[PDB]
Enzyme design. Sequence first.
Site: not given
Ligand SMILES: COc1ccccc1Nc1cc[nH]c(=O)c1C(=O)Nc1ccc(N2CCN(C)CC2)cc1
Length: 300
Positions: A139, A143-144, A157
């Site tokens: 995957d 986005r990942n 992910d």
């Molecule tokens: C394992 O889970 C995931 C799978 C795919 C993508 C993301 C994740 N999530 C994870 C996993 C581990 N560490 C992280 O920080 C994250 C994560 O999503 N963090 C994370 C996501 C989004 C933000 N904001 C960035 C600015 N935006 C305008 C608003 C949201 C900040 C931190």
Amino acid sequence: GEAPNQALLRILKETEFKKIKVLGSGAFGTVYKGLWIPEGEKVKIPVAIKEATSPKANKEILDEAYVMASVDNPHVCRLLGICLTSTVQLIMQLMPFGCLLDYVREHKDNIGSQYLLNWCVQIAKGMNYLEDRRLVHRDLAARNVLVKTPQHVKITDFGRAKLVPIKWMALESILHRIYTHQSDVWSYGVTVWELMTFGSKPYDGIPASEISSILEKGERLPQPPICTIDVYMIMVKCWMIDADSRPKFRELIIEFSKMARDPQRYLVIQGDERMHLPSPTDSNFYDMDDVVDADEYLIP
Ligand SMILES: COc1ccccc1Nc1cc[nH]c(=O)c1C(=O)Nc1ccc(N2CCN(C)CC2)cc1
């Protein structure tokens, strides 16, 4: 036969950490911003906590924990630990800038050729590590890939990782469900295209059922305007019908590194080099006292 997986699965207490806010939500549940203050170590570690309860969903979240704890590389998201509540919580390192897909979209007018190529090298390094560890991601996408700092990205992910996203999948994967490290190379080629186009949707408007026949005919993603034939040639090589003909991740590291030495020769961006992105040597970039990043907090 295979080497024993001596990875340590850290079990964290519910009282050892706190949820600050909600970062993002979906069908899986939600990802929270948080802080982890272990035992009496006088440290505060910025974290991301991945949260209906069912026995099958708990098996899926524990499998993701297994895979995530069995990895250690600067360009791969490692599991810090798990919290054994009614529904298992995965505690990972907070990647403050979120996913690279939303990052390239929101910061397009500030993203230059150096960052773009450095990201490509970094993703190839992380992917080559997964290949060393005999791990097929299944995957890989923009986005990942998460952003720790604009200059440091990591692969995430592992909910699909083993030893459907059609528009990122290799032809053998769509047609025969074959997933190899060379199928991850196809997904890498699409990821590079996602970055070079500053977050465009691959094969936009086209339904997923039409993709299979489109790739079979000889059609591929178009050449991004900023891409020289040199960079596009790489992307195209990742999309060969013959998996063995596609480049290896170790070669992608090499190729993008040579290019990252002279970024302006390989990516043509209007107003490049004058572009600025946050750096750890900036004003208020980061209670704040005793805050340590997970990459500097080692063992219990
Ligand atoms: C394992 O889970 C995931 C799978 C795919 C993508 C993301 C994740 N999530 C994870 C996993 C581990 N560490 C992280 O920080 C994250 C994560 O999503 N963090 C994370 C996501 C989004 C933000 N904001 C960035 C600015 N935006 C305008 C608003 C949201 C900040 C931190």
